[PDB]
Structure formats: C-alpha cells, structure tokens
C-alpha cells in the first residue's frame, strides 16, 4: 500500500509463492534427489505445501537436510508441524535465521485491529478457501469489514489470500500459519477455537474445486481432523 504514497505511473510486479514445479526445479538445481514412491512425491508435496511456496524456507530445508535422504527430509516434515518454523531455522543466504523472524516485523507494522484479526486467523483451516461470514465468527469489531481487514492483511506482507468469486472468500497459507501457531498467545488459540464453535452453533439455530455452501457452514466439523490437533495444542 506504500504506493498510495505515490501519485504516479506506479506499476506493480508481484512475486508469488514458488509454484510446485518451480519448487521441484529449485531442489533439482542444488542436487536434491527427486521422488519415486507415492509417499515421497507426497512427502515433497508436503514440504511444498508446508513451505507454501517459499524460497527462503526451502533453502533452510535443504541446509538442514544433512544426509540428503527423503527420509531425513520427512524427519523435517514432522519437525515443522511439531515445532513450527523453529524446527528448520538455519544459516541461510537470508539475513534471517528463520522466516518467522521476518514475519515478526511484518506483524509489528500492522494496524492494532488488523494485528488482532491476524492474531485470530490461527483457529482457521490452512490451505482452505472460506467465506467472509465464516470468518466473521473469530474476527473483531453486515460484516464486510472483515474483508477490509483481510484485504489490508494480504496487502501488507502477503499474509492471507483473496479470491473474489465464486463467492468472496479468503484463505490462510501454511508458513503464514505455523508463524502464528508458536507465536500467538497459547490461550487465544483455544479461545478462538471456542469462539468459533460458538458462532457456528449460532448459525445453527437460525433454522476440491468447490466452495462450501451456506447449507453446510454449521458444521466446521469437516476440518475436525486439524481442528482436533489445534485443540490438542492450546489446552494441552
């Protein structure tokens, strides 16, 4: 948004997250052995999904992959889920020990209220497209205002992910998630989880390439699997 400072021929070029093929290429480039078995190409889609297309964390991955095996690579695939970005923070061409140290700052500059919204998007599902109202449950203040915050939030460090149609929906990636995991107040995780089961049942009392229908928001139980893990995290 700093470009709004300039009244001019402002032109823009966005560096997206490294697409899955470009990720293969980055691995190939420095001598990392490419898959065969299905749960190895899957292990690598696990890494690429986790490091939601991210140069720096990919490099930290290689640098921390010691023997080079897919096996010890999956070791890391665990470490990333049960230790967040701090599991793979390493000496890298990046000025930063870990992408989390960077995102820290990225999180500091934020409008106090946006700092709140972001702080809350933990208790969501990562790598999932979800409606504005479905977000209105955890986000502070017609709740379109949520969209204004979530837009500012992707605009200011590319922390979210907007997708206009089929329906105005947003989405949170994985690096940007495990940032928030081991970083937001351990309580506030469980508080956001509960505040969600609350408005969900609230909506309950009013009565793949497919978005979640308004007949079915009432059960976020679809993501119970990951939701159960988040719950296993906060309250211990």
């Amino acid at each position: 948004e700093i470009s709004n400072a300039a009244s001019q021929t402002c032109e823009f070029i966005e560096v997206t997250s490294l697409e899955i093929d470009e990720c293969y290429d980055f691995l190939e480039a420095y001598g990392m052995p490419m898959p065969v078995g299905e749960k190895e190409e899957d292990v690598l889609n696990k890494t690429i999904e986790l490091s939601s297309g991210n140069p720096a964390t990919l490099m930290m991955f290689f640098k921390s992959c010691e023997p080079k095996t897919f096996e010890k690579m999956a070791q890391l695939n665990n470490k990333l889920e049960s230790r967040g970005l701090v599991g793979v923070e390493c000496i890298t061409p990046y000025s930063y020990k870990s992408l989390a140290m960077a995102l820290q700052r990225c999180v500091e500059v934020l409008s106090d209220e946006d700092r709140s919204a972001l702080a809350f998007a933990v208790v969501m599902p990562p790598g999932v497209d979800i409606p504005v109202k479905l977000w209105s449950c955890v986000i502070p203040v017609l709740d379109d205002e949520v969209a204004d915050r979530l837009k500012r939030l992707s605009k200011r460090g590319a922390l979210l992910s907007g997708k206009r149609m089929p329906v105005l929906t947003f989405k949170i990636d994985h690096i940007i998630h495990m940032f928030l995991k081991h970083v937001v107040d351990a309580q506030t995780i469980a508080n956001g989880i509960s505040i969600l089961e609350q408005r969900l049942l609230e909506i309950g009392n009013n009565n793949e390439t497919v978005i979640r229908p308004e007949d079915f928001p009432k059960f976020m139980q679809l993501h119970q699997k990951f939701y159960d893990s988040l719950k296993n995290f906060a309250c211990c």
Binding site: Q104, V107, E108, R115, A119, V183, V184, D185, T188
Partner: peptide, 6 residues
C-alpha cells in the same frame, strides 16, 4: 501477552 515481543 498476545503474540510475543512485539
């Protein structure tokens, strides 16, 4: 103490 430092 929401978040960390900050």
């Amino acid at each position: 103490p929401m978040f960390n430092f900050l």
